[PDB]
């Protein structure tokens, strides 16, 4: 019975249910005057493909390193050519049999040589702030211990092992371990030592841990301060000095500061402080805030707050989980610049440096533990680590390290147990551990809807309808009356909503109106802040983002990792510009007569004093009037009516009919803040004098008949097809009805509920909307006016194998300068296919012009795209962009770039300019066809063909959020219908 | 109100509901002594893309031909580079709005100049035997008329238009017309003048039409003869001479021939005859047969017959609908050579020349009218031409021309109204017209299950179960008692069954047993005889077949056109070799003791006198005994027991135990027939003395342990994986469990019935069966025998994200020469995924050898492939083939080539030979992996990689016919289970 398998001991440790061994007690991450040496830099790295063939050849000693090579540390090592990134959403990339690991399991051996001066003696520790997923640590050949909890910190005492002068630190990192079963976040699998490695001296009579407690009495204005300090687990004597408040006190004792300025996301007041013992001093930033739940409302400092949140992953398109500090600071400023006031650290603690930046810049943080067992759901949660008693110690350790590290930061207003981990005994243990350790912060966890072990009711992607019922407290009761009573007394948060994947998210405004109406609604956190795109260079040297499957994954989830409000390089998607407007903290309703505007202060604490209120009147020629208006400060949750200067109203009263003019009132920062320069726009409102309807040209030019062509003023028609073949010299290669668009990511998600759950994209393909064909029925010229005639072209549009159709009639007219086009659309037969109604993407026309377009200008909404349930950030005005800037650089190309609400448009096709006017239409211009757009999986797949594809839509459907959560709301769907609409066209040179 | 559209008159004719105009009355195709001149050859051809731009430039006159070019006539013109073939199954390739045609509609102008001598004067006609789909005919500028009914003949009188000497014939052919709506057969859309164009003189006092009536009185042996002859529609005087029967009689009168030899498919007796008037004589072949329906049985000449049928389309891989006569004769001989006795002309009349060949070679023909409106089904049959009164005249014309052309041929035993045309008034009119015109043949039509207007109950792809209930007369009743009484008194035919697409068809034997058991079952016609592959040459110059979508179709149905028993070049698929055995007309059951065989004559008319009965005993060394045995003729439907020579039994009694020997009794043709040479095999039976079970080698060699390898006799194992890395010097690159195979066409069809209707291929992908992974659990060496040891390798196989698995244990043993491998498979967890049980394709092993294989030999079933529900044609014996001949050249590559029931196998890998033995296993060898097989859409996509992929299966599931009709029958499914099996391996040089 001889056992002959290799590497059984390494594998048995990888399969362990326990937390890491050998590490010091979890504590706060603290800024200390103690000596420190960062071991970051260039290490040596050897990759082996599994435990059984990973060499046990004394490499830890740093001598005779066969097969090592330079690798930066911190790193996610697939980002540097060792293996590849792999992306899964829910599915595990290995067989599900906890706690066992697959045979293919990348093992990365890391090694670094450093110098330890006398200041690291006699006592020092090594601190690892994150290793994915299983680390074993040797120092000078001696085993220190192991790490479990990939985004949690570990510290190992090196006293009596660290030698003066030169030392050799060695770390073996296994990508997969039993811990992988509890780290199934929807993101790239990325092994490595991806956070700081640090040597820290531990002088005697020092401070190991500190627990700040800084409450605020909103009735008295008092701060309630107690700073606890400990060493070796024991409360020690230390002095706490807070200069700004005239405070010297002893650690351990609670005092009442007579008057403090409270901390909030709006006003992040931070008092500098220091706690010190004989051998060590620790610098703190203290924010006085108290969190309370009463009347089913989540309150900070005595006021219900509104969360304007995003879910923040840590991703970098070239460095993986390594986010450089400048990228962190820049992205939180970007968040502030878009009215965001809350962050959820989905779904693991962030880099320890993040916390101070959130304290300073001002965000309400939901700090989330590193726990997700989502992959067990598909088996009915069988073997779920969250309910398996053998994982209890591991999971409690995760919560402990999570809480201890960040417990001092005012910005953390909730602890979260994890994400989509099911329900189970171990989550209850983590809750009980947290409530006892830190009763000052409510506990969040969406995964158990009964809310038995949490303090707030949390859901993800609940529909607008259900959110409205919850806001009113009338959602259906829980079976357990006692649990139901508790949950009904909780405030409600959407930890994830308006999935921001691709074109979208639609429906954001309907959520926001409910957040404002019902105090029990705490708000929501958009899923998610960034796309996880990974930069890839094609053979030519062209950059684009790759996603799941682009890196050879056997199982993957494609572009579901690119679902953000900004791309991986933090460039805004249109959804972010819309989101900023949706969550703007002030509401400005400009009066129709331009005499004033209503101003509501939607903030919770600040008044309007930080803002300058600016107005401008813009017409076709440019700005006609503008200035600033003084507003006596408006209190939070109050409103007033601000008179505008009489010149504005007078200008409006004197406008001729049909002359367009736009009045915009903007609230901008009066002075530089920590997160934007003075004049930065925070909120806005407008009132528009719309251009009158266009006048059809007089039908005075007649139809000139030839053998194979017909001419009506500037329009040449092919007599065979009845379609225009050129307009004013601009060649027209095709004109026809459109009812379809290249499916968005939302259109590829399943239409849940009811008997038909085919995605909308599939419903459309089945129906043939992408392959319409047109039969000509007749061409008549008819008596117009004083010798002129109109031309009517009758057609029927359908698709192969379908009996349903639309009759489309084009009536053309011209006076020689303007072309008038009336289009009439009539349903023919019932638009049902495979048993279910067909819905349309649009009702419009596609002009394929035989010239390229360089510039597109329009009067309408802009500058960015807008669909019926989006475009809140698009304002009324005059806009002009080069063609390439009309498009949107989504990683998977899809329908985008329509400008809804357009009244006029001008395309510069070289020397000539094509001017389109008419009743409100949506405008899109591209250098490639819808089939080239739909076929493209990445942006280099789009190819220009030298034509101009011009879309003029009389109707559009919304974009919704069906990739995850609600589809298009009822009022934005587009069922087949009859339609009619007028355009004017004119070509200029 | 001026109308300006182009080509409205051409289009209005294309949209016409009427049959062609201007043609002479439909008549029989008759062999006449009248002068004839075939206008086949090289014509001139111009293609325009639609009616509106097709030139009206006097081209019919043959002068100034701008844009014409040589094109053979007959032709399907896409086959010669003008446009492309397009394939749809059910869906129309144009919008469904009868009778309107699409704007893109290929218009082919045809022109030929010919010479008409004095023998074509004063009277001649032009005959067109098929134009797809709308022809307009001019002769010397004068319009003759138009053609509707693409596979029906038209004749135009050219008296006074044909000029002596030189004439110019011009034909405009439109691909699409209103007729397209009633010609929706599942096949290539192929416009052209695809059948003969002929000039025929019509001398005075001639014969226009002839209607032969040749009945058989099976009680008296009398023939019942009446030959009708007409001219200009009127019964004329003509003399009928049948030399062989001593007959001279007048046309028009019925006589009783005292004794005739009756015609049947088994014995196609044809009497030569001639009917003549003053100016013309017509040669006929007369077969005396009477068709009757009684006692719910379809009888010919007094006996119920059994139809052994195929559905025959007309297709040629380079000429489209043009089938050269030599290909026709060769393919019907091939049919006879495979025991086929019946043909259904799916779904249109064949070339007129086909009928005489079926009379002569001997087939029961279902002659089917050119009518199919299948594309209307998806709209609930709305606007179905079969029930639209405006199509009545068109549809009756189709039936009339169909019946008139072929009414004289004994082989036509049923008229068919068409195929999948729904139900409607117009089908009733076609039935009433046929029953009145020709009461001597029953009417067939599957589309109306109530059978109101037919004489036989026909169905397609009814399950074995339902066929069994119908055979017993206990199928559920129709709602109308009167209609139910009629249908229950009808015999039952499967006009289509055992869909022969790709690997398959399975389940054929279960149908055949029912056809034999129940007299009401008439038999069935396999769908279908040939694949419609179109030869295509890749850039390299490599040939393969293309199918739907390979020719740029916008809508298509892929490889559903390659669903035949033979490929387009008439090379048999394995399904044909199986089918021939299934329908063999004699049953030979060889006795277990080898003393004799039971012989049942399954024919309906012939005895066994045409057959020589041959026996042979084959052993490992070759033939041991053989000869012929005399059998007193057995009557139809009788049986006897034929003694074999005592030497055979004695040989069997003297065989040592475990020595394999096979006794085969064959019925071969004693003498050359019209369709095969003497000795051609018609039926066979076998009795097998199976080799005893293999003896595991003695476990006397021990396990030699090294650092990274283990050696057990000739086997080297990698110590890391526990898997063999070489066996006797043959490198082993991988060994593991298989549970999956590259989906067949059947596995891609939906599993109808129940809550899960995902295709089996999809069920497997969802379950991860194609991406199994293996974790190593342990490697133990254990005490064997006299110093030797066995090696056990314990593994678990699963897939990423799945909790279910199988434990697989390999126990190896060797005495130095033979390697013994015991494999044990144990289910771990419930194999359920997405709510439904997972089923396996197989339980086996995959050896990936690092050398190429040149030759594969085995003892088992062969020579061709066999799966649990197929392989009837594979007999027991010893077989040996070069590797490339183990594969099957299906147009879409898919699982094929397994040899089930194997007892031993030998692979020649260069110099060395790998010998596998064990209990019954299935054997497959390929030069490429299953993923290369599954990914390949065409055969050039398969790529060899220099390895050998060896599959040894302990269990396989059946292949069924789920691409159309029943899936795998219950007894051949493969639910997960525990299994264990032993192999021996041995390498030789
Ligand atoms: C073929 C181009 C005109 S498509 C063009 O490519 C660019 C990348 O260079 C951007 O991705 C644009 O969004 C895209 O429109
Ligand atoms: C199968 C999905 C509905 S689960 C859904 O996937 C999303 C993908 O972005 C998010 O990650 C959500 O957290 C998750 O609930
Ligand atoms: C890459 C080859 C070994 S696959 C090989 O190709 C042949 C065509 O040349 C045949 O189609 C065989 O069936 C196929 O196995
Ligand atoms: C949708 C199918 C089940 S219809 C099915 O298609 C087959 C394809 O070979 C055959 O042509 C049959 O005639 C037809 O009934
Ligand atoms: Na949502
Ligand atoms: Na995602
Ligand atoms: Na589009
Ligand atoms: Na655009
Ligand atoms: Na069948
Ligand atoms: Na088919
Ligand atoms: Na296969
Ligand atoms: Na094979």
Distance between the termini of chain A: 93 Å
Classification by helices and strands of chain A: mainly beta
Biggest interface goes to: A-B, 56 and 56 residues
User: What's the CATH H-level homologous superfamily of the largest domain in chain A?
Assistant: Glycosidases
The largest β sheet of chain A comes out as: 16 strands, antiparallel
Number of helices of chain A: 12
CATH top level assignment of the largest domain in chain A: Alpha Beta
CATH architecture call of the largest domain in chain A: Alpha-Beta Barrel
Helix content of chain A: 10-25%
The oligomeric status of these chains comes to homodimer
> Any idea how many domains of chain A?
5
CATH topology of the largest domain in chain A: TIM Barrel
Hetero compounds: 1-methylethyl 1-thio-beta-D-galactopyranoside, sodium ion
Strand content of chain A: 35-45%
Overall outline of chain A: globular
Please give a structural write-up.
The structure is a homodimer of 989-residue chains. Chain A has 989 residues and is mostly beta strands. The first copy, chain A, has five domains: 1-205, Sandwich (Jelly Rolls); 206-289, Sandwich (Immunoglobulin-like), CATH 2.60.40.10; 290-584, TIM Barrel (Alpha-Beta Barrel), CATH 3.20.20.80; 585-694, no CATH class; 695-989, no CATH class. Helix content of chain A is 11%, strand content 36%. Chain A has twelve helices and 60 strands. The first copy, chain A, has a 16-stranded antiparallel sheet that branches. In chain A, strand 57 and strand 58 form a beta hairpin. Chain A is globular, with a radius of gyration of 32 Å. Chain A starts with a strand and ends with a strand. At the A-B interface, strand 1, strand 48 and strand 49 of A face strand 1, strand 48 and strand 49 of B. The complex binds 1-methylethyl 1-thio-beta-D-galactopyranoside (IPT) (4 copies) and sodium ion (8 copies). It is classed as hydrolase. The entry lists the keywords galactosidase, cold-adapted, psychrophilic, dimeric, hydrolase.
């Amino acid at each position: 019975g001889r056992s002959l398998e290799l590497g059984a001991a390494d594998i048995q440790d990888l399969e362990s249910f326990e937390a890491g061994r050998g590490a010091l007690p979890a504590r706060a991450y603290l800024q200390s005057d103690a000596p420190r040496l960062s071991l970051n830099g260039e290490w040596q790295f050897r990759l082996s493909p599994g435990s059984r063939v990973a060499p046990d050849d004394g490499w830890q000693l740093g001598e005779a390193l066969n097969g090592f090579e330079s690798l930066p540390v911190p790193s996610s090592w697939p980002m540097h050519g060792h293996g590849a990134p792999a992306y899964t959403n829910v599915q595990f990339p290995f067989a599900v049999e906890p706690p066992h690991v697959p045979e293919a399991n990348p093992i990365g051996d890391h090694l670094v040589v450093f110098e330890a001066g006398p200041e690291f003696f006699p006592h020092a520790l090594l601190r690892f702030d994150g290793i994915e997923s299983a680390g074993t640590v040797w120092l000078n050949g001696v085993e220190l211990g192991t790490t479990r909890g990939s985004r949690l910190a570990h510290e190992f005492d090196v006293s009596g092992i660290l030698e003066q002068g030169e030392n050799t630190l060695a770390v073996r990192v296994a990508q997969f371990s039993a811990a992988s079963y509890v780290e199934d976040q929807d993101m790239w699998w990325l092994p490595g030592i991806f956070r700081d490695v640090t040597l820290q001296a531990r002088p005697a009579a020092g401070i190991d841990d500190v627990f700040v407690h800084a409450g605020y009495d909103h009735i008295t204005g008092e701060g309630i301060l107690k700073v606890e300090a400990s060493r070796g687990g024991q409360a020690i004597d230390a002095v706490v000095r807070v200069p700004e408040l005239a405070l010297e006190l002893a650690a351990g004792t609670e005092v009442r500061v007579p008057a403090v300025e409270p901390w909030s996301a709006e006003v992040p007041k931070l008092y500098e402080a220091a706690v010190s013992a004989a051998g060590e001093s620790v610098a703190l930033q203290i924010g006085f805030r108290s969190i309370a739940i009463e009347d089913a409302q989540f309150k900070v400092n005595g006021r219900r707050i509104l969360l304007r949140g995003v879910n923040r992953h840590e991703h970098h398109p070239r460095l993986g989980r390594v986010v450089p500090r400048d990228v962190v600071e820049a992205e939180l400023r970007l968040m502030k610049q878009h009215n965001i006031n809350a962050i959820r650290t989905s779904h693991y603690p962030p880099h320890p440096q993040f916390l101070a930046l959130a304290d300073q810049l001002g965000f309400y943080v939901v700090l989330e533990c590193d726990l997700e067992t989502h992959g067990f759901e598909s088996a009915g949660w069988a073997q779920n680590p969250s309910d398996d008693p053998q994982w209890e110690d591991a999971l409690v350790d995760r919560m402990r390290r999570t809480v201890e590290r960040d417990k001092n930061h005012a910005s953390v207003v909730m602890w979260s147990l994890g994400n989509e981990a099911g329900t189970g005994r171990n989550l209850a243990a983590m809750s009980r551990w947290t409530k006892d350790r830190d009763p000052s912060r409510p506990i969040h966890y969406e995964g158990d809807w009964s809310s038995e072990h949490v303090d707030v009711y949390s859901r993800m992607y609940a529909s607008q309808a259900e959110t409205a019922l919850i806001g009113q407290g009338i959602e259906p009761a829980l079976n357990d009356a006692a649990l139901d009573a508790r949950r009904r007394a909780m405030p409600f948060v959407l930890c994830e909503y308006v999935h921001a994947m691709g074109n979208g998210p639609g429906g954001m405004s309907e959520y926001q109106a409910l957040f404002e109406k019902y105090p029990r609604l705490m708000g929501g956190f958009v899923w998610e802040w960034l796309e996880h795109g990974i930069t890839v260079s094609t053979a030519d040297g062209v950059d684009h983002y790759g996603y799941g499957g682009d890196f050879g994954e056997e199982v993957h989830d494609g572009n579901f990792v690119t679902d953000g409000l900004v791309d991986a390089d933090r460039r805004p998607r249109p959804g972010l510009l819309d989101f900023k407007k949706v969550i703007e903290p002030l509401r400005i309703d400009v009066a129709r007569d331009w005499t004033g505007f209503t101003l509501r202060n939607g903030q919770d604490f600040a008044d309007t004093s930080a803002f300058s209120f600016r107005y401008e009147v813009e017409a076709d020629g440019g700005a006609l009037d503008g200035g600033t208006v003084d507003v006596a400060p408006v209190a939070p949750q109050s409103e007033t009516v601000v008179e505008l200067p009489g010149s504005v109203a007078a200008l409006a009263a004197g406008l001729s009919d049909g002359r367009p003019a736009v009045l915009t009132v903007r609230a901008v920062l009066g002075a530089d803040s920590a997160w934007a320069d003075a004049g930065h726009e925070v909120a806005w409102g407008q009132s528009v004098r719309e251009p009158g309807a266009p006048v059809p040209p007089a039908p005075v030019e007649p139809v000139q008949v030839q053998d194979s062509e017909l001419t009506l003023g500037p329009v040449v028609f092919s007599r065979a097809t009845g379609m225009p073949t050129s307009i004013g010299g601009v060649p027209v290669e095709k004109l026809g009805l459109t009812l379809w668009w290249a499916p968005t990511d939302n259109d590829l998600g399943r239409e849940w509920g009811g008997a038909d759950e085919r995605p909308l994209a599939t419903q459309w393909k089945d129906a043939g909307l992408n392959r319409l064909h047109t039969r000509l029925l007749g061409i008549s010229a008819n008596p117009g006016q004083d010798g002129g005639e109109t031309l009517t072209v009758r057609t029927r549009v359908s698709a192969a194998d379908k009996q349903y159709g639309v009759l489309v009639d084009y009536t053309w007219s011209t006076d020689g300068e303007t072309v008038g086009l009336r289009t009439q659309v009539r349903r023919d037969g019932t638009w049902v296919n495979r048993g279910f109604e067909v819905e349309w993407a649009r009702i419009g026309l596609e002009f394929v012009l035989g010239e390229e377009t360089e510039l597109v200008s329009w009067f309408g909404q802009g500058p960015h795209q807008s669909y019926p349930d989006t475009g809140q950030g698009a304002r009324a005005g005059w806009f002009s962009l080069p063609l390439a800037k009309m498009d949107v650089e989504y990683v998977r190309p899809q329908e985008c770039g329509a400008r809804s609400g357009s009244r006029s448009a001008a395309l510069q096709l070289g020397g000539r300019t094509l001017e389109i006017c008419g009743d409100p239409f949506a405008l899109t211009v591209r250098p490639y066809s819808q089939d080239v757009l739909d076929a493209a999986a990445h942006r280099p797949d789009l190819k220009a063909d030298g034509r101009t594809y011009l879309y003029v839509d009389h109707a559009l459907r919304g974009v919704g959020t069906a990739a995850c959560g609600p589809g298009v709301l009822e009022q934005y769907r587009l069922k087949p219908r009859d339609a009619d609409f007028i355009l004017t066209l004119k070509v200029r040179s």
